[PDB]
Amino acid sequence: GSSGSSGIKQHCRFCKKKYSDVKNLIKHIRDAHDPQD
Ligand SMILES: [Zn+2]
């Protein structure tokens, strides 16, 4: 009705992908991109 229904939005700008669970996003990057390294 009238209430900001929480909803996180994480997108791998790098590959313009989408991951429901952020935890996966991080693992996906360090696995594919791995820029930090
Ligand atoms: Zn990616």
Side-chain angles (χ1 to χ4, degrees):
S2 304
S3 199
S5 307
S6 54
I8 55 162
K9 46 209 270 178
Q10 296 283 20
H11 48 120
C12 210
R13 177 73 82 84
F14 309 127
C15 56
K16 292 282 197 158
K17 275 203 170 293
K18 288 173 284 297
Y19 289 94
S20 54
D21 293 83
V22 62
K23 279 285 198 70
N24 281 86
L25 163 62
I26 295 90
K27 277 207 290 184
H28 154 73
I29 298 153
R30 68 177 210 203
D31 280 333
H33 315 293
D34 200 320
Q36 73 90 239
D37 191 307

